[PDB]
DNA sequence: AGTACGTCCCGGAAGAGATTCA
DNA sequence: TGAATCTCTTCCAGCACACATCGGGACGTACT
RNA sequence: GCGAUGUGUG
């Protein structure tokens, strides 16, 4: 039922919606949002558990 | 407030007025020089926010 | 210190320069900034680094130019005070050893090597508040006492 | 079992790390303009933020 | 030499979406 | 079509003490 | 001769 409620149906527009919740207003950009979501759970820099 | 020293623990009101005045003065100096519209917009925006 | 009077030629030149800066350079600067922001938005983008540095520099230069244009005042004396190298004349001083200068008293902003090399800032010119055709302008330069016999003064 | 105790050690470590991530920014900045060896690291480092 | 002086900056509750019996 | 039922987001959380620290940095210079 | 934060008192 969640997947039913989903508005989007691809990696592209998925990342789009994510970037849209993160930085409101600003227009999207494919590789921009790509790198963004890459820079939230998958890099030494801005995320870490000890 | 003259603190004991060569400084002054300025009240926030002072600094605020100060910012406003700098902003208004740059705006004044711009208009007479017909600087471009993007600049004057950024100017007015900073002013409103100030 | 910094004499708030500058040449009218310098004023016109700096005005045209700031016009060209805020009218031409800033637009392409912002365009390059946006193009770097296109999917870059990172701390590794050398393009974005150069763009931001140039943006800060352009901002500082524009602020300084606007301040000099408004607060200061222009001064370009005519040859009415000819001979008088107080202002408005490319005056020259010879030396006994070959230190021959030939410049005009210009402000501390439009300092270059396109018309002269003089400035109202150093005492070596501050002692020259109003010169003549035979003034023995001597001073204690930064590495010893220097001197120059005024050999020519005229405007153009 | 889910609360955790830090100590001066952890505090210093973490905050000192924040200091180094402060400095590294300008570090890499000035490295960008890097010229041939006429400099030394202390030229491209500033303790003052740390 | 190195700087004191320059600028530069959890509960509530009510509104605007926004959703659903028509 | 339109009156109900969610849902972001502004506003307030006791009184009176006592004492304590701390309050710009940064960037750039005409000199000191 | 101000404000922040903390500590303690009832």
Automatic annotation (TrEMBL), chain C:
Entry keywords, A to Z: DNA-binding, Elongation factor, Protein biosynthesis, Transcription, Transcription regulation
Source taxon at top rank: Bacteria
Record Pfam families: GreA_GreB, GreA_GreB_N
Nuclease as UniProt keyword: no
Record's keyword annotation contains Protein biosynthesis: yes
Molecular function as annotated in GO: DNA binding; RNA polymerase binding; translation elongation factor activity
Residue stretches making up the Transcription elongation factor GreA/GreB C-terminal domain: 81-155
Regions that span the bilayer: none
SUPFAM superfamilies: FKBP-like, GreA transcript cleavage protein, N-terminal domain
GO biological process, one term: DNA-templated transcription elongation
Domain Transcription elongation factor GreA/GreB N-terminal: 6-74
Functional description taken from the UniProt entry: Necessary for efficient RNA polymerase transcription elongation past template-encoded arresting sites. The arresting sites in DNA have the property of trapping a certain fraction of elongating RNA polymerases that pass through, resulting in locked ternary complexes. Cleavage of the nascent transcript by cleavage factors such as GreA or GreB allows the resumption of elongation from the new 3'terminus. GreB releases sequences of up to 9 nucleotides in length.
Stated family: Belongs to the GreA/GreB family. GreB subfamily.
Protein's name according to its UniProt entry: Transcription elongation factor GreB
Organism: Escherichia coli
Gene symbol of the encoding locus: greB
């Amino acid at each position: 039922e969640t997947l039913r409620v989903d508005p989007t149906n691809d990696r592209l527009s998925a990342l789009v919606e994510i970037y849209r919740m993160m930085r409101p207003g600003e227009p999207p950009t494919r590789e921009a949002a790509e790198s963004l979501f890459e820079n939230l759970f998958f890099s030494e820099d801005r995320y870490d558990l000890s | 407030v003259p603190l004991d020293g060569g400084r002054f623990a300025t009240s926030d009101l002072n600094d605020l007025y100060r910012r406003v005045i700098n902003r208004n003065n740059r705006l004044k100096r711009l208009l007479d020089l017909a600087a471009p519209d993007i600049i004057v917009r950024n100017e007015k925006r900073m002013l409103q926010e100030a | 210190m910094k004499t708030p009077l500058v040449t009218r030629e310098g004023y016109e030149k700096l005005k045209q320069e700031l016009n060209y800066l805020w009218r031409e350079e800033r637009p392409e600067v912002t365009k390059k900034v946006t193009w770097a922001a296109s999917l870059g938005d990172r701390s590794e983008n050398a393009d974005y680094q150069y763009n931001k540095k140039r943006l800060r520099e352009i901002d500082r230069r524009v602020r300084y130019l606007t301040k000099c244009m408004e607060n200061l005042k222009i001064v370009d004396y005519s040859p009415q005070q000819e001979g008088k190298v107080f202002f408005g004349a490319w005056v020259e001083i010879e030396n006994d050893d070959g230190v021959t200068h030939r410049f005009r008293i210009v402000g501390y902003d439009e300092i270059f090597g396109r018309k002269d090399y003089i400035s109202i800032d150093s005492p070596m010119a501050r002692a020259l508040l109003k010169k003549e055709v035979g003034d023995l302008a001597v001073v204690n330069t930064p590495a010893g006492e220097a001197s120059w016999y005024v050999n020519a003064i005229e405007y153009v | 079992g889910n609360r955790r105790i830090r100590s001066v050690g952890e505090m210093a470590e973490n905050q000192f790390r924040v200091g180094l991530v402060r400095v590294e920014r300008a570090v890499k900045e000035r490295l960008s303009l890097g010229d041939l060896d006429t400099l030394m690291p202390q030229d491209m480092i500033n303790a003052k933020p740390i």
